[PDB]
Each structure stands twice: as C-alpha cells, then as structure tokens.
Design a protein around this nucleic acid. Structure first.
Ligand SMILES: Nc1ncnc2c1ncn2[C@@H]1O[C@H](COP(=O)([O-])OC[C@@H]([NH3+])CCC(=O)[O-])[C@@H](O)[C@H]1O
Ligand SMILES: [Mg+2]
Length: 468
RNA sequence: GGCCCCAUCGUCUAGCGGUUAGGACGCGGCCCUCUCAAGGCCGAAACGGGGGUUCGAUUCCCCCUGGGGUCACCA
C-alpha cells in the first residue's frame, strides 16, 4: 500500500514548513487509502528543545491533520521518537561495519576542521586503518564515529518522482558519519533505518533534502533494502525569496494561532503553495483537497509566503465558510485575553454578526469592537471633532429618543430619518456625530443596529455622557 | 566556488504547440451607502536573454542569466 510520514525535529517552535509538508503527506496517504505516520526526529541532543515535541504534535492536530501512528497514538512499529531507538541504529551501524559498507574514524573535531581547511571535506583517511586495529581501539573505548564507506569511484542514481532521474557522481557524495561518538545516529542513518522498519513507501519532504537522497539510496543498497519513492516539495520562502525563516517571516504555527488565524484558513492557504485545483477554485475544505490531489497539479517553484493573502483568506473564511455561531465561539478566547466580557450568547452573537465583514483575524474583533463590550473605549480626535460639530442637533434629538417606546432598528431609523428631514439636513449630519458618541469611533457598522444593540437605557445613558 | 533543483503579472498560480496568456491577493476607479468595511463592475500589471526543433512556440531541446538548496559528529 502507501505509507507516508512527517518527521519533525523538536528544536524550536512548531514550523509552518513542517505543517506544509505534513499536509501533502496526509493527502497522499489518504488519497491512496494508506497510512500517515509521525516520527519525532530528536537525535541532536545539543539543539533539542524540551516541550518542542508536544507543540508540533498539537499544531498538526490544530491544523486539522490526523495521523495513524505516532508518539501519542500508538502504532506497531514504535517507539516513534528516535531518542528511544538508539540501540537499533547501533545495531545497524555495526552491521554496515561488518558488511564493509562503513568504517570507524577516530579524528577529533579539531583535526576534522583542519582536514576540512586543507582539503575541504573529509578525505576518508580512516579507511586505511586495519579493521582489527579499529575494533581494538574501539573496545579500548577510544571515542570515534562510524562513517558511510562510499563506493569509490562510482555514480549514484536518485529518482525523484516529480523531476525525474538525477545521477550523482560519488565524488560528490561524502563518507558521511552514520553514528556520532556520543552513540547517537545522524539524520541519514536513522532516516533510512526507521523509514524501512516503519514501512514508508513514499518519502515526501522539502527540496532542501534532495541532494542528501543519494546518501540514502546508497544506505538502502548497503542494507539490501528496497528504496521508497521520493517526492521533493519546494521550500516556502521569505519575501526576499530565501527559504522562509524566523527573522524575516513568521514561521511559528503558534504565532498564527495566537494572532487569530483560523486553522482551516491557514491550511487552505498552505495547500495553495505549489498546488491548485483543476477549476482554479481557491477556497476548499481539507477533505476536498485530499480527493483532488494529484502530483500532476503540484508546481515546483519556491513560493513566497504572502501574509497579506493569508489574511484575505482568513477574512474570507470568517465571513463565508464558517457559520455565525462558529465565529462567535472562536472569538471568545480573544475577548477573554483582552479582558473583555460579553453579557450573553445572544449579545455576543449579534455583536459578532455586526462586525463579521470588518475583521480578518479573531484578534482584530476585540480591537475594533471594544466599545461594544466595555465603557473603557478610546475616542478618536476625528470622532471627537464630529461629536462637537453635532452637539446642537443631538441635544435636540435626545428628547425624541427618550420618547421612543419601540426601541427597534426599523423604528429608530424612521425616527432619525424624520429628525434629519424636519431639520432640513442630510442623515449623515446627525448619524456620524451620534456614531461618535455611541462608539468613540467613526468606522463602525450601521448606526441603527449599533443604536439598537445596547437597548434604550444603555444607548441614551452613553449618549448622555457625550451631551454632558 | 563544486554539485543539484527551479524559472508566466509585485505575490500565489492556470496553461501542458496555435489563447484577446485566464483566475486570485494586493493596487487604481466606479456602483452601493448614515460612516468604515463587505459585495458587484471596470482597469493597470507577466511569458528573463540567446540559439535551435517545428508551418507555428509561453509550451520541446541547448547554452547563458537569475533565484534556491547542499557541501557539519544540524537536520
Ligand atoms: N522552509 C521550509 N519550507 C518547506 N518545508 C520545510 C521548510 N523547512 C523545513 N521543511 C520540511 O518540513 C519537514 C520537517 O522538517 P524538520 O522538522 O526541519 O526536520 C525534517 C527531518 N527531521 C526529516 C526530513 C525527512 O527526511 O523527511 C521536512 O520534511 C522538511 O522538508
Ligand atoms: Mg494582462
């Protein structure tokens, strides 16, 4: 069948590039009724960040992805954390040693640096150490690493399903270390061992790994295992076209969640990086994406992540994909965070309804409609000027307002329309200043709905402080 | 610098020999209108350069250029 995986390294914030890749592995697996695996690649104890694992795992679920096997969902080929698989890599490294597909090298990092400075890269000098001597020095406990013994001279063919065949000359392939002197494996060794033991048949990862694939093809040969298919996706880019990074772009998935982007929208935007629906449609569900997925519709250029288009899509989701109620619910955390409270579900729902076409992120809602939940709201200088210019007619309208029994949008409008007419003046000449008094802003939703919202008492009560 | 990948509007992209080279974001205008948005309509905006192949290339091949990646006991 088809078995895919996402192999995040817990070394920092949950990365958007990881979400992007996970997304296509998930679709390919599901599209073929296969299995999507999560394997935590925590082999670099120096860069390992505690708490990073939970964060990427939580973020993948937040985005809407589900995995069939992994650290927290079980699976028949665990552990799904490489740090817990050390004896396994050890065993396989030693097997390569015995097959004469690798050798022990005992150079100190300082020496390797010198070698690199003199000849560039490693010259594979340790291959000249007698096998028995190497084993003896190993038993004595002399620190060392185990390196891949590349067949020299030679050539190595890699097959990328999206770009065709690429033939590397072994002189371009270094005798990479397979097992570090701390007993930990390097990415290359653990990747091939685990992909094979976990049954991965389709390796989908970012293009940054294409050049290292020949190393993997050689490892599969050394172990005598069948290589899986390889699909290298393009790298997400910063505005300047360099691969997306923390200092030039927001690469943390937690940042997106904290900023009020809907996971559904972010995921939908991510699907547009290197992929498109047959009919050009831009808004679609995760399930629709799975069904339409085809490698024929995947484009290879490096896409720049456009925060602006993402915000547009998030606003699109907010007003046309989700229902009023879903938005109302997803807005609560952000109200709380802003220290704002809402009277009841009915009030909140109506407030969200009035602001729906006016906010692209859940975070903008508490910011642009603060005056709807608290008396602690700012009044713009421009709102203040409009308020003063209209004080005279408001003073006159005030009593009419307090005379209104049916405090309804339909009624209030008729009342105001009349007041502006009998005063031989345009509605705006009264609407704008009333808006400023009611909200402290001159950019809000319709006046009648804003006036109606709080109810007679609250409306006039606030109007009074203004006329005061 | 060596090797490898890539190349249509500013950005994401459709196209897969013949099109007025289409859509979307963003940008400009108009409509709508009590403000601001939302929405509708209109508009400006691209095939990097040079050779080929072919009746005919945005599309097929080659070089150049540009961008990206990789040359760690990081992944
Ligand atoms: N800027 C970027 N744009 C697009 N994709 C990006 C990316 N940065 C990382 N990736 C990709 O996300 C996945 C996770 O990467 P990572 O957590 O850095 O470690 C990935 C490696 N541990 C395993 C790679 C593999 O063999 O599949 C990987 O599969 C990697 O390709
Ligand atoms: Mg045009």
């Amino acid at each position: 069948m088809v078995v895919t995986r996402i192999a995040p390294s817990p070394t920092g914030d949950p990365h958007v590039g990881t979400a992007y890749i996970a997304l296509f592995n998930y679709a390919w697996a599901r599209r073929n009724g296969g299995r999507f695996i999560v394997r935590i690649e925590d082999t670099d104890r120096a860069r390992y960040v505690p708490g990073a694992e939970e964060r990427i795992l939580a973020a993948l679920k937040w985005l809407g992805l589900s995995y069939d096997e992994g650290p927290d969902v079980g699976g028949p080929h665990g552990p799904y954390r490489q740090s817990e698989r050390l004896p396994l890599y050890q065993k396989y490294a030693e097997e390569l040693l015995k097959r004469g597909w690798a050798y022990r090298a005992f150079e100190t990092p300082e020496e390797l640096e010198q070698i690199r400075k003199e000849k560039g890269g490693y010259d594979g000098r340790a291959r000249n150490i007698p096998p028995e001597e190497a084993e003896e020095r190993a038993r004595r406990g002399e620190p060392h690493v185990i390196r891949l013994k590349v067949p020299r001279p030679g050539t190595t063919e890699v097959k990328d399903e999206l770009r065709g065949v690429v033939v590397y000359d072994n002189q371009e392939i270094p005798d990479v270390v397979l097992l570090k002197s701390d007993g930990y494996p390097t990415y290359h060794l653990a990747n091939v061992v685990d992909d094979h033991l976990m049954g991965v048949t389709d390796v989908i990862r970012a293009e940054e790994w294409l050049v290292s694939t020949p190393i993997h093809v050689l490892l599969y040969r050394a172990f005598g295992w069948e290589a899986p298919r390889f699909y290298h996706m393009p790298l997400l880019r910063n505005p300047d076209k360099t691969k997306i990074s923390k200092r030039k772009s927001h690469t943390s998935l937690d940042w997106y969640k904290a900023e009020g982007f809907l996971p559904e929208a972010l995921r939908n935007y991510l699907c547009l990086m290197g992929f498109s629906m047959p009919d050009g449609r831009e808004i679609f569900t995760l399930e629709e994406f799975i069904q339409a997925f085809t490698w024929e519709r995947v484009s290879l250029g490096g896409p720049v992540f456009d925060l602006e288009k993402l915000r547009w899509m998030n606003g699109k989701y907010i007003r046309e994909v989700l229902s009023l109620e879903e938005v109302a619910e997803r807005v609560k955390p952000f109200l709380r965070e802003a220290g704002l409270s809402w009277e009841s579900e009915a009030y909140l729902r109506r407030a969200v309804e009035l602001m729906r076409p006016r906010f692209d992120t859940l975070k903008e809602f508490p910011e642009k409609a603060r005056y709807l939940f608290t008396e602690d709201y700012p009044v713009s200088e421009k709102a203040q000027r409009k308020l003063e210019e209209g004080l005279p007619l408001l003073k006159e309208l005030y009593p009419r307002l307090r005379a209104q029994e049916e405090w309804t949008e339909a009624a209030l409008e008729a009342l105001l329309r009349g007041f502006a007419a009998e005063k031989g003046v345009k509605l705006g000449q009264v609407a704008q200043p009333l808006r400023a008094a009611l909200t402290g802003s001159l950019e809000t939703p319709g006046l009648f709905e804003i006036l109606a919202l709080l109810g007679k008492e609250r409306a006039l009560r606030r109007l009074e402080r203004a006329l005061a």
